[PDB]
Amino acid sequence: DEDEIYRHIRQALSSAPRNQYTVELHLQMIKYADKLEHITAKAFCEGTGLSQSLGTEFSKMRNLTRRLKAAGLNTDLL
Amino acid sequence: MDEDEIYRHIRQALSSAPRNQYTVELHLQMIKYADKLEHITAKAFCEGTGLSQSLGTEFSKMRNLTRRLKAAGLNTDLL
């Protein structure tokens, strides 16, 4: 499961234009955070091809996602 | 809503949040009001909300997520 998720994230990021990359990165983190609750930020960056420096950003987005879902976000639609 | 009243809503939510929820609340408030603040710079956002200019980059990131988040069902009235 996690490896399929990482492939989907990589396909989305590799396809994003430069000026949409940061947005797409954050949206992919939010999209899958609820299926990756058990993973470390380090493992997330390794799986997706991201610099390990982005780990804190994943940790932030994973916390944010719980509150966005409570406000109606359906992460399947991202 | 005038921009300053939006800033006051953000300041009030930040003041009301527990310390251990501050950073999440800040990002949620940025998302909540980004689309009513489309005309402001991140510098003006930080000045209006009493935040360090170093947080401007956080507003720049969050404000550009709203279109896709709302299309996926996010109701900012619930934030």
Residue numbers in the entry:
A (entry chain B): 2 to 79
B (entry chain A): 1 to 79
The authors write:
Consistent with analytical SEC, RptR formed a homodimer of two helical monomers each comprising four alpha helices (α1–α4). Each monomer presents an extended α4 helix splayed out from the dimerization interface at the C-terminus; the intervening surface consisting of the two α4 helices forms two basic (positive electrostatic) regions that likely present the DNA binding site of RptR. Although structural homology searches using Foldseek and DALI with the RptR structure did not identify any close structural homologues in the PDB, the arrangement of helices α2–α4 is reminiscent of the tri-helical motif of HTH transcriptional regulators that are also dimeric. In contrast to RptR, the dimerization interfaces of HTH regulators are typically distal to the DNA-binding domain. In RptR, dimerization is mediated through hydrophobic interactions between residues in helix α4 and the unstructured C-terminus of the protein (i.e. residues L74, L69, R68, E25, and L65). Leu74 of one RptR monomer interacts with Leu69 and Ala72 from the other monomer, and vice versa. Dimerization is also further stabilized by residue contacts that are more distal from the C-terminus including a key electrostatic interaction between Glu25 and Arg68 and a hydrophobic interaction between Val24 and Leu65. As the crystal structure of RptR bound to DNA could not be obtained and given the very high similarity between the crystal structure and the predicted model of RptR in its apo state (RMSD = 0.50 Å), we used AlphaFold 3 to model homodimeric RptR bound to the 9-bp DR sequence. In this model, the α4 helices in a RptR dimer, which form two basic clefts in the apo structure, form the main DNA-binding interface and insert into either end of a single major groove of DNA.
Here, we describe RptR (RMS-proximal transcriptional regulator), a small transcriptional regulator of a defence island in enteropathogenic Escherichia coli composed of a toxin–antitoxin system, DarTG2, embedded within a Type I restriction–modification system (RMS). We determined the molecular structure of a RptR homodimer and, using transcriptional reporter and in vitro DNA binding assays, show that RptR represses the promoter of the defence island by binding to a series of three direct repeats in the promoter. Furthermore, we demonstrate, using the structural models of RptR validated with electrophoretic mobility shift assays, that the minimal RptR binding site is a 6-bp palindrome, TAGCTA. Both RptR and its binding site are highly conserved across diverse bacterial genomes with a strong genetic association with Type I RMS, highlighting the role of RptR as a novel regulatory component of an important mechanism for anti-phage defence in bacteria.
